[PDB]
Each structure stands twice: as structure tokens, then as C-alpha cells.
Amino acid sequence: NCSRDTGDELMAALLAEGINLILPPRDNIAPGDLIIADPQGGARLGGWHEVFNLQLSPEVATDPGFKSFQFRASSILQVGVAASVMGRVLQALGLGSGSFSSAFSSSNADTIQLSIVAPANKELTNFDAVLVQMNEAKAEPATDRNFFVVTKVWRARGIRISVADKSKKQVDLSAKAVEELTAKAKMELKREDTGSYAFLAASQLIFGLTLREVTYKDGAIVDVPFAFIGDDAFVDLPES
């Protein structure tokens, strides 16, 4: 569980953009998509037809393409936290927390410095007009759930780390660690000439969403301005 009140430079940069980190990373979420969340449970992608008896979604407008965006921030993570974080992010690409714990322990690592490689975003440009269209449909309500519209999709090529021992000396991953990670990984593991390691997909994957909360009140859809789901900076978000 990664608290959003953590004092972490990259975490603060992500939250300044309203980013809800979603799990697993993926390729199939668009601006305007709907998330349905249980305030006392989980969240998932859903459809407006689960909230209203309609057929069509509103017409969404987006940026023509993704726009590059650099965070200029890194996270400094104690190795046990780093294994949990990286394992949660990369489990669907073959690398869970136990693999990272084994790798870091074999490497005499104490802290990991983590940054995001080649981030970009794509925005929903017509949020208010989406709500106008919904309210012009006059659809019947299909109740204690929360509803979020995706207003920005964030993608990245992967994660870069620097490994340090207890004296804050930068060190390589052990050969055992590299072999364990490379055997399981469904992505590229590259040692950079600076001594950092990059964990890279072949193209940019969606890792985060900016959200706006909406609610249904007295016969209208109303905006509740970044919104955040639950109590964990990471949101486990099954596909619809």
C-alpha cells in the first residue's frame, strides 16, 4: 500500500498532475473512459450503461496524439519498499516483488533510485461537453459507488533505477540478480553505461490516469480539480 501523503519527489510530481497509477500497465484505455469504484472496495473500468439505460457513450474529443512530458524527479526507495513497488508495477511483465527482493538481496542493495523513462500524455479535451451530452440524453438511472471520467492517459517506456549499498555507493546488480530477472522478464533489462538499469517495454505503455469525479444527483450528471481513487497511490484496475 503506497500512501499518497508520502514525501517523495517523484510521487509529489505525479500527484501534482493528478496521476492515479494503474495496475497492470496496458495499452487499451482512452480519455473519456469510465471507472466505477467501490469506496470500500475496488475499482474497475466500466460502461455508462452500468449507470444509465443508454446505448451510446458521449462523443469524446482528445488531443491528436500523445505529447511528451518529463517529470524531472526521482524516488529514493529503501530496497524492501523498492521490491514491493517494482513488483507491483511489473508483475504482469513477469517480475513480481519476490523476484526483486531476491535480486536486490543478492546485490547487497540498500536503496534504489527510481525514475520514469519517456513519459507522455493524451488528454480528453471536451469533458464539460461530455457531461452536456449525457444530460441531454435524459437516460434513466440503471448507487453507493463512485464514478470517475478519465481526463488524461499517461504512458511511459519503462523505469530506470540506480542501485546503492548501505554506504550510498552505486553498485551493479549481481550476476545472479540479472539472471533471475532476465529469465522471468517479459520486457528488456538493460545496463546503462552510467551504471543505472533500464526496464523497458518495446513501446510506451499506459501507467497512469488523471481523473475527474462525477455523480448523479436530482436527475443530472454533475462534476464533483483532480480526483484520486481510494487510499493507495496505486489503483488495481481490471479491464472491462
Q: Which stretches within the chain are classed as H helix?
A: 9-16, 79-90, 97-106, 127-137, 175-184
Q: How was this structure determined?
A: X-ray
Its domain, for residue 137, covers: 9-229
Q: Tell me, yes or no, whether 37 lies in a domain.
A: yes
Q: Tell me, yes or no, whether 238 lies in a domain.
A: no
- Report how many domains make up the chain: 1
Q: Tell me, yes or no, whether 239 lies in a domain.
A: no
Q: Tell me, yes or no, whether 199 lies in a domain.
A: yes
CA distances from 161 to 91, 127, 206 (A): 17, 36, 19
**Rounded-to-integer distance, Cα 61 and Cα 44, Å:** 22
Q: Tell me, yes or no, whether 236 lies in a domain.
A: no
Q: Tell me, yes or no, whether 29 lies in a domain.
A: yes
Q: Tell me, yes or no, whether 55 lies in a domain.
A: yes
CB neighbour list of residue 216: distance below 8 Å, 6 or more residues apart: 51, 141, 147, 222
**Rounded-to-integer distance, Cα 208 and Cα 17, Å:** 10
Q: How far apart are the first and last CA of the chain?
A: 23
Lookup: cell for 108: 547487497
**Rounded-to-integer distance, Cα 150 and Cα 144, Å:** 20
**Rounded-to-integer distance, Cα 171 and Cα 161, Å:** 11
Q: Tell me, yes or no, whether 3 lies in a domain.
A: no
Lookup: cell for 180: 533471475
Q: How many CA atoms lie within 13 A of 136 on its CB side?
A: 10
